[PDB]
Design a protein around this ligand. Structure first.
Ligand SMILES: [Zn+2]
Ligand SMILES: [Zn+2]
Ligand SMILES: [Zn+2]
Ligand SMILES: [Zn+2]
Lengths: 634, 634
């Protein structure tokens, strides 16, 4: 049995051929929108300080000006080509977008004395790349204001690389965000972060080769940046009212809090002077995720559609062009009004149809099966295709949000873990060789869907079964070939790759400098997750922390192996008090500063049982960002 | 194959005998707390207008002063025995509680001139019955104020039976609520209502007969009311700040907002005069659900633990007795502080341990299997047992909250619907007879857990297979006999019953009057759900609605078979304009008033396409509330 990337099968290639028939020949239209406004194209490479490639558009050369392979769905192929159109873009004078040098875009407005920015890109390396391309056709000006459209890494991540941390702590540089920015940014990207990062490797297929048999696109971009630095710098102006007009450096900004939609903290941005609406990530030219593959809190389709409807109302007529922080803009008032209404109708449908079926008694997989397409004319639009988010996932995601993972059927109340259930299903079907045969029968029958369900149990029951991995991976690869959904493809490809070759060595949050923005309370929130309950039981203790610089007081309490904290108080009878400053912690947190060293320097002062601090730090786990996904631990 | 309720199996009874030894012997402590303050006991019946029974405590007589049967887990039997302690209780002079006439409790505070209430129970009938019992021992006074402690039907559903709609509308009776009450109460109980009510039939085993081989208790109560009226009356004063003091009828009320925890809209109530804390449903004497079986939004254990630690800090030192809106109070400051400390550690642990393992790479069923108990002394407390919420469910609920239903493994990206998967697995195992063989072997082995997974496949493949159904029911029954979890037992019993004798004809929301509180926007949010998209595809149209009494305008738009709405505006080019009143709408809504009848009456003015209004109402589906759960749909 082979561990090589197989070609498209008879059945795969045919399925893809059929798609050519079913796709509407209203082509070129969108291509015209992709290309319009282009100044300096980019098809090169971006490197970090050590010389490693962080972004590389050149690897996608194969998509360009060619027809679709059988190893790719034609619809996705098209979308993949569109995201290939990258570089520097003029919308209107004084208004620029840098596309295809990050999964995200960067919108820069040429202010009076300086510059106003919308979004910082994913990484400090891409951000400075973006600006570098800008300054190369436009005059050099400093940065007066930055706009975080949402609490998403691909937008706040490139921050520290283009703006100084202290100009924001002082106020010389104003930074605009949505309400509850910091609390949600740190949850998604830090508190469940190790899981999120690793699952994310599947979402964008980051370690998967770029080719027609492998990695082609990520729907709203190509993929993400590799071996680069995730930064985080907290905002100084928190927009908390539903609408707000602010003015800075001679630019008028109309903000629309779209909280709870695409991000838990998210806002749109309108520019009166230009007659332009920035929907951020709220209306991309592809169905978005209500539940992201990397893992996040479910999003609200209902609120999502209302916010789009609000945009359509409040700015629908006074807009000539709509620009987003992902993909190309849409030109002409008529077209934006139609676009937004279709976008609204989409998310509204997801919510309403799912809720319709729920009250009809359908369970999440039933619903996903029963709704095969968007209703009416929404089906025929290129910008509502399941390229990023899946109609199916999204329908399940509504059931999740309103009712949960449990389907109501007591037979699904307490499912067996994958290893347990695998072993039992294999036995039930006659053992390894019996299922292997059934797998082959299904791969020949071109039922790759069932083959993976079959193979999954087997690989989990016996991960040493080399013929099971090879088969499972082939079945997945085929599913990746057939799928319209750029994200699904990435996941099926990364699946196959890791079934075959194991888990590659790479940390998504290796270079990360996001722990700088962490307040002490967010830090101890992290330590609570880090703490090993089982070891910690028996070692009950209380710890006082006084942050002399921030004049902050936190009371940590470890009881029954559970860690809890009180911000703004101190326990009198605490076992130890730790007097220090934010930066001192910062270096203990990034492992720069040795425990016994710190006490000698005078940088950490102790009152009580010092051996308690040491023993408390001993009780912390560290998380490997390199865990198994398609086979069992470790 | 038999369809009768089977007795305990040798392994089941054995398992249940072992519980006796491992349960802590410090019984009686909890009984003394439940009995304390009892004035008037209740074991009676409560009946509706048509004389049907809505609530019967005497049905549980079998539990009283008797030892546990082999068909019920001893720990649960204890819990059941405590929930049998029902009636009117004095907490302190001027402070009374009505327990065990409803799944929830009623707190009654005697004021300067009238009565201050906390929660109104589930139904008009029970609520009236609670006040009867009170007035039978305390002086008849009017209700001056009501407090909705959270947006759960067991706390707001009985309001209309005891206070007047227009009195609240005017401001004579102050009704307090936590921020966003209406929004979340109408969402959970009306928008997703038919699903939630039916799934709720399982959660409380409503149609399951009460006895040792069937229904016995529901953790924080016995069950819910049957054949009763759910009401809803919108509050007039909303608590928006984290803490608020209010004095009404000479009663000092401190509110602590605890939004996101047990309920989206939720708060605690401190009574400084008394030195008592009402923790509503935030600290019941049992683990609570982070994800409820009936179905609702996931709950935030992190917040949950945080709010408790807040109560502990801000009220723990000035609290002599803690009272709850379910179960008995806890007496003694030292005891309440221990109690709240333990409860906080619990929800903190749930969140933190799950998140720990998540970052370690474990999936939801893996973490469920890995964590078998609460840590340290938390395991040893009666008030933290999984009687209501399950430890496994809650662990899975943390996974759901932060990551979602998808485990990251692409094999599980696109699962088959129950029927599809069932037919395939059955085939893969060698068809009905072969799987029935395997089922039989599993029941003999005492593997009731595996049996139900096996049988579910079969029953869904062919719901006419009476052996399958009968076996699956027996296995479900044993699982029910074994479980400590009141909710799970209910679910397993209801399932076994419906597998055997089908779904009985009962509407939980039969007498419901919750549509009366619905404002027009709410009513249209409901219609968009009710709308049949396939049908309404092709009938695109626009409707203006003007509410003469409310002075409110609503712009309905139906596009691509999807219904959206705009509040505060009218579209000038609408196919029709309707000018009416809220009462008028209600009567058409409750089906009491025909369409053409109303038009004639002058209560409904049309402006445009008259035919259109008719063709719009004929596009809405009706939900049957009797859908199958343990087998595929009708
Ligand atoms: Zn985003
Ligand atoms: Zn983005
Ligand atoms: Zn509740
Ligand atoms: Zn309750």
């Amino acid at each position: 049995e082979s561990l090589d990337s197989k070609p498209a099968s008879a059945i795969t290639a045919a399925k893809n051929a059929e798609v050519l028939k079913n796709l509407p020949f209203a082509d070129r239209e969108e291509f015209e929108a992709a290309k319009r406004g282009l100044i300096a194209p980019f098809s090169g490479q971006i490197k970090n300080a050590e010389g490693q490639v962080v972004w590389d558009m050149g690897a996608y050369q194969f998509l360009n000006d060619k027809d679709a392979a059988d190893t790719v769905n034609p619809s996705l192929w098209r979308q993949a080509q569109l995201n290939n159109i990258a570089g520097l873009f003029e919308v209107m004078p004084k208004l620029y977008q840098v596309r295809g040098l990050d999964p995200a875009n960067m919108t820069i407005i040429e202010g009076d004395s300086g510059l106003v920015l919308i979004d910082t890109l994913t990484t400090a390396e891409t951000a400075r790349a973006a600006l570098d391309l800008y300054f190369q056709h436009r005059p050099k000006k400093p940065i007066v204001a930055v706009v975080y459209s949402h609490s998403h890494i691909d937008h706040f991540g490139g921050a520290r690389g283009i703006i100084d941390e202290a100009d924001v702590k002082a106020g010389k540089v104003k930074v605009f965000a949505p309400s509850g920015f910091m609390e949600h940014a740190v949850s998604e990207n830090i508190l469940a972060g190790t899981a999120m990062a690793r699952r994310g490797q599947y979402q964008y297929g980051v370690m998967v080769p770029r080719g027609a048999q492998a990695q082609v696109d990520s729907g709203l971009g190509k993929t993400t940046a590799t071996n680069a630095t995730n930064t985080l710098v907290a905002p100084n102006v928190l927009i908390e009212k539903p609408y707000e007009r602010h003015t800075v450096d001679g630019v008028e900004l109309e903000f629309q809090l779209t909280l709870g939609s695409e991000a838990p903290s998210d806002m749109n941005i309108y520019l009166p002077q230009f007659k332009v609406l920035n929907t951020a990530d709220n209306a991309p030219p592809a169905m978005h995720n209500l539940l992201t593959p990397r893992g996040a809190e479910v999003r609200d389709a209902k609120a999502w559609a209302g916010y789009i409807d609000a945009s359509l109302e409040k700015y629908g007529d006074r807009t000539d062009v709509l620009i987003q922080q992902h993909n190309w803009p849409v030109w002409g008032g008529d077209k934006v009004r139609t676009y937004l209404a279709d976008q609204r109708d989409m998310y509204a449908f997801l919510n309403n149809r799912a809720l319709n079926l729920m009250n009809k008694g359908l369970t999440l997989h039933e619903i996903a099966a029963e709704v095969s397409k968007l209703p009416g004319e929404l089906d025929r639009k290129w910008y509502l295709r399941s390229y990023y988010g899946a109609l199916s996932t999204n329908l399940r995601a509504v059931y999740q949000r309103y009712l949960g993972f449990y389907d109501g059927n007591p037979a699904n109340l307490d499912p067996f873990p994958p290893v347990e259930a695998g072993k039992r299903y294999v036995e039930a079907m006659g053992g390894a060789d019996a299922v292997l045969k059934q797998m082959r029968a299904a791969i020949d029958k071109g039922d790759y869907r069932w083959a993976v369900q079959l193979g999954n149990h087997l690989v989990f029951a016996d991960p040493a079964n080399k013929d099971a991995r090879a088969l499972q991976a082939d079945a997945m690869e085929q599913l990746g070939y057939q799928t319209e959904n750029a994200l699904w493809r990435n996941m099926y490809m990364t699946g196959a790759m890791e079934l075959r070759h194991g888990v590659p060595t790479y940390d998504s949050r290796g270079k990360s400098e996001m722990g700088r923005a962490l307040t002490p309370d967010m830090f101890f929130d992290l330590l609570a997750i880090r703490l090993d309950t089982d070891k910690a039981v028996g070692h009950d203790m209380t710890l006082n922390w006084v942050f002399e610089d921030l004049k902050q007081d936190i009371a940590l309490t470890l009881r029954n192996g559970v860690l809890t904290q009180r911000v703004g108080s101190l326990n009198p009878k605490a076992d130890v008090t730790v007097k220090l400053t934010k930066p001192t912690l910062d270096q203990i947190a990034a492992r720069k500063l040795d425990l016994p060293t710190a006490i000698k320097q005078g940088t950490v002062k102790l009152d009580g049982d010092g051996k308690k601090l040491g023993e408390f730090f001993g009780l912390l786990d560290s998380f490997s960002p390199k865990f198994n996904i398609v086979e069992l631990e470790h």
